[PDB]
Amino acid sequence: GTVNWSVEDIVKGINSNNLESQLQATQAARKLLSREKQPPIDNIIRAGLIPKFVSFLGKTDCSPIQFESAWALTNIASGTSEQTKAVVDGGAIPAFISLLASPHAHISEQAVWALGNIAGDGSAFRDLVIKHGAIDPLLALLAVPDLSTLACGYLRNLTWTLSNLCRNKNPAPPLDAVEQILPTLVRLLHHNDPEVLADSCWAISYLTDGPNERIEMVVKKGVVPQLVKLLGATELPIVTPALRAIGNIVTGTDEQTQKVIDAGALAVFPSLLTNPKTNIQKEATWTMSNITAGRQDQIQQVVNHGLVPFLVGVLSKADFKTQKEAAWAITNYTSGGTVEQIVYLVHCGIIEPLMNLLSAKDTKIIQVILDAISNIFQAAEKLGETEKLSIMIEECGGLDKIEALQRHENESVYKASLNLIEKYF
């Protein structure tokens, strides 16, 4: 043989009245479609084979042709939106959902895989898969006392497909669907397989990527301690989605943010804020910026965990996108912090790295930094210490950056700049 058939040969066999012949041609098509160098997906579609493949899904007496067409349709569905649409238009969604019940584990797994590709196209196909009733049979495949008695590759594929049912926005998944899936997802979040664990974190990060009501659905399931545990893992494919989920959560209410602090997340941040992977430092700092946007007692938690020197470090040397988050973290800190907390920030050395970033061409970061300066001067005014801080910004060259920015293109930048000049500078 079934290796390297022409498409016209495949058509001839599928159009024969002979189920065995059809099986040989379907396998041939599967082998064409499973080659890494540009599989002929459009050719297979243009030959009108998808309806015949979908009808083979229902041939319970010929499980080999069920598997071969399932695999063939899987790889078509893995293509572009137009190619996934052709699989959907051929009626494949109900047929795959029926296959979830097959007594042949490799066939139900293939159905699981295919639905994951269809659902992975976007919210519309995701919700169509849900409306056809995929969730109940998928979850029933995972209704065992001990997950570790399932085949590793089977369990990984189910986790990945479930994570696609949690993915995408505009709109987010149906509330009923999320709430039906969550308990199984919480169980997978405690499984020992690193790939199951990564995809479960990814699913949780999707569900926490939204309004506070969505964050609350997840947090109410008690998964935040497990997220913090996974946050400390050595495997970066696990840390990345774990940090994403934590960062999502601390964009919600102050009470939801507090659960992350209570679970111990801040103790991991010395390593996260120096992590050699650029994306980890960026999203660790982004997470910090939304904690320092919180309550003064939560800012005080950041101080107590020794994280202000780590913010000074990121602000001093990091990828610029990480430095921008660090600028945000500081402006949030200085917006809500106490005078004593703001003084502590200055004593840790925030001024000079904050000045140096006034050379960046990013207009938003200059605004963010200039706003932090006002907040910090405001604290010095409640102490008569403005003069001593004015000198600090001068003594490290900050006022060259400020007394120049008064002639900037942006109006809000020019206004804050000459204001800082006239009031102190």
Added chain:
Amino acid sequence: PAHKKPKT
């Protein structure tokens, strides 16, 4: 992570 993936 991958939205879609073929079987190889």
